[PDB]
């Protein structure tokens, strides 16, 4: 459990240290706590194939505050990190190319944020008037039912 | 100056066994950089999965890798178990192993058999896709569907093994053997294979930890890692098999090491078939697993409990689990999160299939495109998993 | 003399209740006949796998159930192409791409939905990225349901189709305009 | 005030700030039920 | 067996109207013994000899030649599918349904007038008024 | 049977397919809605098409009155509406009915009605 | 390595607004260069004048923002934008979005005033 | 497969409204209403299946406690229009009605291990 | 949200009696509460007629003689929104059922050639009959009628005549009866204007090319019967749909060769003699210039003043110089790059033949 200041040096520890040779990048995710103060959590998971085990660090954000970037130790962190971003909106400072990598070119929002909708925004159809697939407000024949 | 020239392998067409824009820069034949674009089968499985019980939820894993669905569905069942605290039965156990094994044949069925054929060998697919059937058929029987079978789930197997069905199981692997030897002969020791093969999508056992892949693609660069020995889950502890490890990190190593899968899931299979055990195929706690029938229609409290747990579901301790499996394509992991009620607070799926494309990037720079066809077969990349 | 005057009929059958009487009506069923028969034992669907329905599609291609015995081949490029099989989810996304491979198809041309989650959207109908239906995008002729649509449930789909082209009116319905 | 606008960066339509209102609550306990533990919790609809 | 041999016996076991019927039909010349037949007159087959493959030894011949697997009637479409062994020809009178109603089958209708028209069984949840008048009295 | 339009014209459909089911002319429920409200709401979609071949299939509530009542000795009649004929449960959960009222009383799964012996 | 693409930007909150005054003017500067191009791969039917005029539009809706680091943030997804839009990544479907005005005009009632939206249950 | 509503041997039909497969359906693809019958019986006057929007996973199936809605080994049911695959009640009840003999084979053979 | 911008109530009372509530925000699962029949929508109007209304969920009844020209008006709308039935003019049954539900009809049928089965008159003035007969019998609402510019029951012209003679009858059997009289329309893949400017291997004109009219844009008139059909106030009227600016044919050619950077070929050959190479013509099968319509390219467009205008329906028209790009565009080669003289110093500094 740490803050963003200390994710570089704390994962080169777990990356270069003898005992704790943590050398793959598993996973690195966002979760949305909007109850705290700082609502996002920033979990990344490592395993060493040297020793047989995984740990797990944890930090925190905000839709306007960033993180580090782990790319300069571990490049497998390009794509999870941008994934965070798209999902979330956690901006990871240092990243080379921080991108959308999951939604729709022009997707207005984060999805798995808890105030983004089950069923979005908006919706697409076909115009033929236009002769376009255009963006329209959403409509749906049978309302969601939550249970 | 090097000028760079763009072009879109294609959002659809036939190399991508799914739906890919990889744009990729040429100098002359060989690619400078690449650019795999994703996202055109994202389908928002996450954030419904946190709108669903999890037992509505875990038809989301059988459509995420679909060619392995019961080795997602038992990632997901070994996270909601160990969240659970409860032990499924040795019968369960054994039957998740012996299908597991099953999954992981057709994952290397389709795999090899369409690397093949994107490289250009067009009868390997179409012979082993009758031996996908014949193991279609088994799933099926099991659980009524051909692909998607929901037939692993939290607490064990939804419902018991048929009568007759491991006699069938080993009147197939009699003969599988000399399926595998049949494809052998087309592609190992052929020139053409290992032109198109050796010394393709080299990647060092270093940058292959950096990148964060695992399976084969971890195993071709000489890391004997493989999570069923080294964190034995369901019943792999009590099977008897051994791992392939390669040299060289290439794609040859890569479908040497496949091949040699294939055969070790057979002998597993072999072994589950000879020591199946007795008893329940899910926890006989009626409150987290539905009752039989025949109780359920003459007992009041298994009524009581068949009611909530279809209709609220069962509630699971608040915490959170990352665990993983050796799925046939890698490690495929699942980081869940508990708020204590019935519906998941958080559930990630790390496929293996996103990190290896990731790494198309630095496996595939200044190789030519057709050998970027053949790393996007040794990938394995099925692309509901890489989007989830 | 300028014609003020009609002796058009009524109670004239429409199409579908039409029974040929006359040599001519004969001859352009024959045509039609011909046409039709060439359309269905040529049939050849655009590479549109999109998702897990492409594998009930390749196991069509398979021994078991071979679609080349029916005449089935698939075709990469559009132009080549006379079907689309939606096979899987419609990302919006992807829904342009869509679009795009069907209006590059020469007619005639037919589409066919395989699997709920290109029917109506399906499991994931209720997501912010999914499109509930090819319908929304292009216009379909057959609806194979299931998830995934057994191959032989996809295989009777083209049947379907295949009667439809084969009760297709071409010179008979020019012989109507 | 001095309270950031994350609306600004949220993607999020403006009819959201502009035209609806939300309500704060807790769960009234049910008269059906004996039980409160849906309760405690401050739900945003 | 595809071997001509195959055929050949087979079309000397069913007669050459057997043959043309199967070759305008099924494509393929199949010798098996009459099992049974349905409501809408399909007749099921089976077969015994080696050369048929596993799934080959049982069969149809549709009575339309507008055939459709839909037109097969249920138990026969199991039968047909190796589900059960024993057609409901030779079922007993036990593990038949009971019917308190007349049994009607209707294939497949689509591209049809008799095509499904899906409507709501029910009426609107909410009643309106019938306006009726009064006069101040 | 004229049905009359919410534009003022008629429809015409015959007697047959104006019943809710064969075995019964009327509704058996507030909510239902009757062949009448369907054609007369929905006729755009029923215009060209064949009312032969649309699924009609017979209602319960007459089959389940022609069953004749079950006669116990006792205050109690158990239900279990099991096959018999075929393993497994195959029934809707066992249920005891009390009996000792006057008239019949029917299970709340079956509509099978018992009486005690009077 | 996994190397940028084009006209990739590596993420930098600025610790200033003198500094994210330059980078905003510099990203406008670009996108009023890069129109020309959006007209080109964009079957666009109208003006590249047009296009600029959405632009500058666009850069006033967050004219008079003073947090900084949201100002960071909208630059961000300012260029993430750019980079879609510059390298062909969109389709004529998603750069249409921003360009609603340019269609057609939507019938014949748009409600101004109560009566109105009343009258169209919308008030 | 497809689905359907089944019947007692009485000719009444087995469900009663307990709203069990709407509520497990991870698709949200059953919707159902009702009300009490004029004979003072628990009974549907709505049960639609969207089959567009069904993964045809049991759960239904296993869900209900009468053995009232089930999957049919049929698959042969492709249709022209997409309305036709908005399955009713008195579609899915006719469905029952002539998949009556198969779907008890299915029982006689599967009832057991459920 | 989505807006009806169509309707300005949500409360709409037809002139038959139904009461139609509107339902929902104005989107693909909303719902007007109108039901129309559209008669010729596999075409060019009518398929933008078709689109607008179920836009907003009209249910619009499509009859269709070809299974095939008509499918793409079901992705138009929602399940029940377009409903599809098979007529044939020669079958009055087919009409009835046609128009039995509906509160609003559109005849837009008509031909710009003679077939074997159908004349000028026999589409334009008997089909109009049994439509207005059949819509007098159930007493529909509202009856919108498209009768061609320069309709007049005498005139050089049979399509004129016939068009002229059909807006009697259907007046005199439907006397609420709206006649809309569209010019010249253009668009996308248009019958006989701008598509076949950009695409013919040379025009020809009887006259010089010299006939004048004022073209007006397809969507802008199906707009217009957009708001026809739930404006009311037009019952018993007649429309001049024409456009705001004037041209002559040569005009338009010349803008069509500008937009395309191509020479459009044309020819300037005698009446005498593509008249009679036109009358030949109507031997093939597929549709060719007819005759009547190189006696129409005498005849300029006349408008009636006393008819009824776009202004009148709060519409303003776009005009062809506007939109000729956005039309022919597909159709401009684009043969080169400007000046390629100051590329070759800069050109200097790349690599053209790797190493
Ligand atoms: C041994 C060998 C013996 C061979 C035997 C062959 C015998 C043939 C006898 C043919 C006699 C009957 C012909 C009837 C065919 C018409 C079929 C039909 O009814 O319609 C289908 C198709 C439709 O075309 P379309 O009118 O545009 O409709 C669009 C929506 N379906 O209709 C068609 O397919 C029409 C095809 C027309 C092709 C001509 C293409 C144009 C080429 C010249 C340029 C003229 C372009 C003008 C286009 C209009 C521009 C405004
Ligand atoms: N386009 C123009 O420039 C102008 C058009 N108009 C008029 O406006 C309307 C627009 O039609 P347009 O936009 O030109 O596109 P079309 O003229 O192609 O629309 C023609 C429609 O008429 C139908 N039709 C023709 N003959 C018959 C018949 N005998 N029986 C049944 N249906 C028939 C066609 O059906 P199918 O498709 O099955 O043949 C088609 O739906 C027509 O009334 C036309 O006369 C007036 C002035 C200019
Ligand atoms: C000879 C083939 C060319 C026929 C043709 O070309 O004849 C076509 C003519 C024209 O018909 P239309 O009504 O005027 O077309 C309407 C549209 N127009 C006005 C633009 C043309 O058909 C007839 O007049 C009636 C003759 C029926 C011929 C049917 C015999 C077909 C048998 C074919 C055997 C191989
Ligand atoms: S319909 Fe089912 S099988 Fe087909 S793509 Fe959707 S989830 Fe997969
Ligand atoms: S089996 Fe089909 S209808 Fe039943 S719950 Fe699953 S998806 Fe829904
Ligand atoms: S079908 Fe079964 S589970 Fe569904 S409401 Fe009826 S009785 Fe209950
Ligand atoms: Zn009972």
Redesign the interface.
């Known amino acids: 459990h740490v803050a963003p200041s200390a994710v570089i040096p704390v994962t080169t520890f777990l990356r270069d240290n003898t005992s704790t040779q943590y050398k793959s990048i598993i996973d690195i995710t966002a979760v949305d706590y909007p109850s705290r103060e700082n609502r996002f959590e920033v979990v990344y998971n490592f395993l060493s194939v040297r020793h047989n085990s995984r740990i797990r660090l944890k930090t925190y954000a905000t839709e306007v505050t960033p993180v580090p970037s782990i790319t300069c130790l571990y490049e497998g962190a390009n794509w999870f990190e941008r994934e965070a971003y798209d999902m979330y909106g956690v901006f990871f400072e240092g990243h080379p190319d921080l991108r959308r990598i999951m939604t729709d070119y022009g997707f207005e929002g984060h999805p798995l944020r808890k105030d983004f909708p089950l069923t979005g925004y908006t919706e697409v159809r076909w115009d033929e008037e236009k002769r376009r697939v255009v963006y329209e407000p959403l409509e749906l024949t049978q309302a969601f039912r939550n249970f | 100056?090097?000028?760079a020239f763009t072009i879109n392998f294609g959002?659809?067409?036939?190399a991508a066994?799914?739906?890919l824009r990889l744009?990729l820069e040429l100098?002359?034949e060989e690619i400078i950089?690449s650019?795999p674009?994703?996202?055109?089968?994202?389908?928002?499985?996450?954030?419904?999965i946190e709108?669903?019980?999890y037992?509505?939820?875990l038809?989301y894993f059988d459509?995420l890798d679909?060619?392995s669905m019961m080795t997602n569905e038992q990632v997901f069942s070994l996270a909601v178990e160990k969240l659970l605290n409860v032990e499924v039965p040795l019968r369960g156990k054994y039957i998740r192993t012996m299908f597991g094994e099953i999954t992981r044949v057709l994952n290397h069925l389709?795999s090899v058999c369409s690397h093949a054929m994107d490289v250009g060998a067009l009868t390997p697919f179409?012979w082993g896709?009758?031996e996908?059937?014949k193991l279609?058929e088994f799933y099926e029987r099991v659980s009524?569907?051909?692909?998607?079978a929901?037939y692993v789930r939290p607490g064990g197997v939804?419902?018991?093994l048929?009568a007759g069905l491991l006699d069938d199981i080993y009147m197939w692997a009699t003969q599988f053997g000399d399926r595998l030897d049949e494809i052998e002969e087309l592609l190992t020791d052929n020139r053409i294979w290992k032109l198109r093969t050796v010394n393709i999508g080299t990647v060092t056992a270093?940058?292959a930890?950096?990148?964060?892949?695992?399976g084969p693609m971890?195993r071709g660069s000489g890391?004997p890692?493989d999570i069923r020995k080294?964190?034995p889950y369901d019943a792999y502890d009590k099977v008897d098999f051994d791992v392939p490890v390669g040299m060289n990190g290439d794609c040859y190593d890569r479908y040497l090491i496949r091949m040699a899968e294939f055969r070790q899931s057979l002998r597993i299979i072999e072994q589950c078939c000879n020591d199946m055990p007795a008893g329940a195929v899910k926890v006989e706690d009626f409150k987290i697993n539905?009752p039989?029938?025949?109780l359920?229609?003459?007992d009041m409290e298994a009524?009581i409990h068949?009611?909530l747990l279809?209709?609220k579901g069962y509630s699971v301790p608040p915490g959170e689990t990352?665990t993983?499996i050796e799925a046939p394509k890698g490690?495929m992991?699942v980081?869940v999160?508990s708020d204590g009620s019935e519906r998941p607070?958080?559930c990630?799926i790390?496929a293996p299939g996103?990190?290896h494309?990731?790494?198309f990037?630095?496996i595939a720079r200044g190789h030519f495109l057709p050998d970027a066809v053949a790393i996007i077969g040794t990938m394995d990349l099925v692309f509901?998993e890489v989007?989830? | 003399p300028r014609v003020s005057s009609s002796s058009m009929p009524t109670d004239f059958p429409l199409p579908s209740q039409q029974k040929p009487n006359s040599a001519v009506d004969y001859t352009l069923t024959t045509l039609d006949a011909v046409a039709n028969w060439a359309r269905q034992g040529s049939f050849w669907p655009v590479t549109f796998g999109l998702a897990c329905c492409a594998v009930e599609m390749m196991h069509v291609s398979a021994p078991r159930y071979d679609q080349d015995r029916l005449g089935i081949i698939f075709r990469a490029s559009p132009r080549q192409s006379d079907i689309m099989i939606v096979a899987g989810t419609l990302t919006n996304k992807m829904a342009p791409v869509l679009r795009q491979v069907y209006d590059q198809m020469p007619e005639p041309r037919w589409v066919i939905s395989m699997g709920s989650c290109a029917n109506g959207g399906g499991y994931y109908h209720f997501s912010y990225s999914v499109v509930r239906g090819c319908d929304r995008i292009v216009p379909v002729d057959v609806y194979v349901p299931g998830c995934p649509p057994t191959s032989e449930a996809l295989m009777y789909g083209v049947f379907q189709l295949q009667r439809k082209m084969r009760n297709t009116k071409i010179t008979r319905m020019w012989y109507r305009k | 005030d001095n309270v950031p606008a994350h609306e600004i960066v949220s993607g999020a339509p403006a009819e959201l700030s502009r035209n609806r209102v939300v309500r704060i609550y807790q769960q009234a306990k049910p008269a059906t039920q004996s039980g409160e533990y849906g309760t405690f919790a401050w739900r945003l609809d | 067996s595809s071997s001509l041999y195959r055929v050949l016996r087979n079309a000397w076991e069913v007669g050459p109207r057997s043959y043309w019927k199967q070759l305008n039909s099924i494509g393929d010349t199949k010798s098996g013994r009459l099992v049974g037949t349905d409501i809408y007159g399909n007749k099921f087959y089976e077969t015994d000899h080696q050369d048929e493959i596993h799934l080959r030894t049982r069969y149809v011949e549709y009575k339309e030649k507008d055939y459709d697997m839909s037109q097969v009637e249920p138990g026969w479409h199991f039968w047909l599918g190796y589900g059960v062994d024993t057609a409901p020809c030779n079922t007993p009178k036990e593990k038949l349904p009971i019917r308190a109603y007349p049994y009607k089958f209707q294939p497949n209708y689509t591209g049809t007038p008799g095509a499904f028209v899906t409507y709501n069984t029910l009426k609107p949840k909410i009643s309106a008024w019938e306006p009726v008048t009064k006069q101040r009295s | 049977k004229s049905i009359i339009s919410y534009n003022g014209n008629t429809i015409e459909i015959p007697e047959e397919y104006t019943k809710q089911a064969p075995n019964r002319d009327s509704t058996w429920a507030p909510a239902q809605a009757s062949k009448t409200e369907i054609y007369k709401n929905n006729m755009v979609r029923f215009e060209q098409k064949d009312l032969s071949k649309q699924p009609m299939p017979y209602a319960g509530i007459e089959l389940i009155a022609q069953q004749p009542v079950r006669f116990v000795h006792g205050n109690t009649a158990v239900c279990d509406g099991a096959n018999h004929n075929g393993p497994g449960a195959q029934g809707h959960p066992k249920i005891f009915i009390n009996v000792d009222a006057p008239g019949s009383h029917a299970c709340q799964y079956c509509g099978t009605r018992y009486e005690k012996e009077h | 390595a996994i190397i940028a693409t084009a006209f990739a930007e590596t993420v930098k909150f600025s610790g200033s607004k003198q500094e994210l005054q330059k980078r905003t003017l510099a990203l406008y500067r670009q996108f009023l260069r890069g129109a020309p191009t959006f007209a080109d791969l964009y079957e666009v039917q109208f003006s590249i004048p047009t296009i600029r005029t959405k632009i500058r539009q666009e850069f006033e809706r967050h004219r008079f923002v003073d947090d900084l680091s949201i100002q960071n943030v909208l630059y961000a997804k300012g260029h993430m934008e750019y980079q879609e839009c510059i390298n062909f990544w969109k389709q004529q479907a998603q750069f249409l979005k921003y360009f609603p005005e340019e269609d057609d005009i939507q019938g014949r009632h748009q409600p101004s005033n109560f009566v109105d939206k009343f009258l169209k249950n919308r008030a | 497969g497809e689905h359907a509503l089944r019947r007692y041997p009485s000719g009444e039909e087995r469900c009663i409204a307990c709203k069990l497969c709407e509520a497990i359906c991870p698709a949200l693809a059953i919707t159902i209403d009702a009300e009490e019958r004029i004979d003072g019986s628990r009974r549907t006057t709505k049960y639609d299946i969207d089959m567009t929007k069904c993964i045809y996973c049991g759960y239904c199936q296993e869900s209900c406690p009468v053995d009232a809605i089930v999957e049919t080994p049929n698959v042969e049911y492709a249709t022209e229009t997409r309305e036709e695959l908005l399955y009713n009640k008195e579609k899915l009840l006719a469905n029952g009605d002539k998949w009556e003999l198969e779907l008890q084979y299915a029982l006689d053979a599967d009832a057991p291990y459920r | 949200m989505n807006s009806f911008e169509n309707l300005a109530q949500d409360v709409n009372i037809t002139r038959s009696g139904k009461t139609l509530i509107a339902k929902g925000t104005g989107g693909r699962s909303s719902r007007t509460g109108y039901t129309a029949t559209v008669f010729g929508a596999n075409g060019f109007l009518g398929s933008y007629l078709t689109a607008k209304l179920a836009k907003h969920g009209t249910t619009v009844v499509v009859p269709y003689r070809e299974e095939m020209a008509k499918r793409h008006l079901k992705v138009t709308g929602d399940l029940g929104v377009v409903n599809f039935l098979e007529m044939d003019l020669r079958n009055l049954e087919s009409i009835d059922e046609a128009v039995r539900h509906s509160d609003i009809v559109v005849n837009l049928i008509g031909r710009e050639y003679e077939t074997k089965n159908f004349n000028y008159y026999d589409v334009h003035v008997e089909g109009a009959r049994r439509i207005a007969e059949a819509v007098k019998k159930h007493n529909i609402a509202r009856y919108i009628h498209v009768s061609a510019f320069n309709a007049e029951i005498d005139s050089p012209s049979e399509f004129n005549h016939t068009k002229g003679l059909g807006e009697q009858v259907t007046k005199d059997i439907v006397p609420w009866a709206t006649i809309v009289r569209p010019a010249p329309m253009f668009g996308r893949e248009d019958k006989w204007f701008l598509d076949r400017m950009a695409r013919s291997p040379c025009l020809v004109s009887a006259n010089k090319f010299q006939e004048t009219s004022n073209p007006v844009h397809v969507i802008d008139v199906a707009a217009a019967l957009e708001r026809i059909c739930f404006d009311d106030s037009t019952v018993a009227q007649t429309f001049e749909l024409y456009g705001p600016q004037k041209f002559t044919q040569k005009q338009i050619i010349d803008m069509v060769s500008e937009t395309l950077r191509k020479e459009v070929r044309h020819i300037e050959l005698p009446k005498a003699l593509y008249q009679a190479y036109t009358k030949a013509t109507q031997a093939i099968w597929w549709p060719t210039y007819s005759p009547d319509q190189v006696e129409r390219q005498f005849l300029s467009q006349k408008i009636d003043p006393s008819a009824k205008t776009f202004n009148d329906l709060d519409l303003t028209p776009m005009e062809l110089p506007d939109l000729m790009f956005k039309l022919i565009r597909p159709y401009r080669v684009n043969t080169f790059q400007h000046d390629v003289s100051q590329l070759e110093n800069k050109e200097k500094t790349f690599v053209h033949i790797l190493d």
């Open positions: 100056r090097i000028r959002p659809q067409h036939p066994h799914g739906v744009i100098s002359g950089r650019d674009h994703v996202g055109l089968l994202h389908r928002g499985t996450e954030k419904l709108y669903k019980t037992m509505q939820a038809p459509r679909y060619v389709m179409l896709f009758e996908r059937e279609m009524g569907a051909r692909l998607h929901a939804s419902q018991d048929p270093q940058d930890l950096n990148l964060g892949l695992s971890l890391i890692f080294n964190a539905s039989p029938r025949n359920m229609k003459e009524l068949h009611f279809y209709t990352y993983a490690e992991g980081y999160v607070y958080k990630k790390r996103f990190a494309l990731g790494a990037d630095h509901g989007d989830r």
